[PDB]
Amino acid sequence: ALKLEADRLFDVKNEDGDVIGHALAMEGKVMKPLHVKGTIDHPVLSKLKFTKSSAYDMEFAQLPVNMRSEAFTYTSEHPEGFYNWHHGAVQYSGGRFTIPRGVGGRGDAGRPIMDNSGRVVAIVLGGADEGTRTALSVVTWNSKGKTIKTTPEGTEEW
Numbered sequence: 158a159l160k161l162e163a164d165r166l167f168d169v170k171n172e173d174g175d176v177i178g179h180a181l182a183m184e185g186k187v188m189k190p191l192h193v194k195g196t197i198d199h200p201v202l203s204k205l206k207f208t209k210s211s212a213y214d215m216e217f218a219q220l221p222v223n224m225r226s227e228a229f230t231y232t233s234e235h236p237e238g239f240y241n242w243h244h245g246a247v248q249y250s251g252g253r254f255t256i257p258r259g260v261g262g263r264g265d266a267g268r269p270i271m272d273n274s275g276r277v278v279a280i281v282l283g284g285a286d287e288g289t290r291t292a293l294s295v296v297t298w299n300s301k302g303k304t305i306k307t308t309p310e311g312t313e314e315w
Contacts, residue, residue: 163227168198169267178315179267183229183277188217190266190282192314213296213306214282214314229269232276233300240278242270247293253309254279255290266315270295285309 169178169189178193180202187202191214197203205218220228240247240254247270248255254270261284269277270293279295286292292309299305 164224165227165229166269167202169193169195170198171195176264177266178264181229181267181269181277181280182220182224182227183269184231185220185225185228186217187220187224188215188280190214190280190314191216192282193266210304213304215296215304229271229277230275231298232272232278233298235272235278235297240270240272242281243268248290249278253307254293254295255287256284256293258286258289258291261291261293261315263315281315282306283308283312283314285312 165182167180168176169180171177177195178190180187180189180197187205191209191211201221207216207218209216235249237250240249244260265281266283268281270279270281271277279297281293281295283294284291294308294312297305
């Protein structure tokens, strides 16, 4: 089990070059959180014309015909239980995605949350610490393709 995967997750760096978030190829588009003001570290992607979507903290461009294959798949069905993400397990209960306190922060905006079949279930934007856990502020689409945005009280954008 070698982890040979397509180029789907890209970096977004700041003026001096600090990774401040992520951008992903999914469902024909390259998308990244609008609040992440940096450049996509990619010779092709960084030259695209990005359409803004303030209401959802999303910014997106059309994936070059070629790359359209190297992309994630979305899924609007997320039964309660555990999910996967860069830092480990993400729990989904009570309509909320949570991670342990002190784990998320700058650099995590734009990172997907996936299931065991490898489909994206959401995209992290920020988090609000509640007790021993952190409630994430994510973007998720419903069965009818409508973009939805969940933002807990006191969410700090990452």
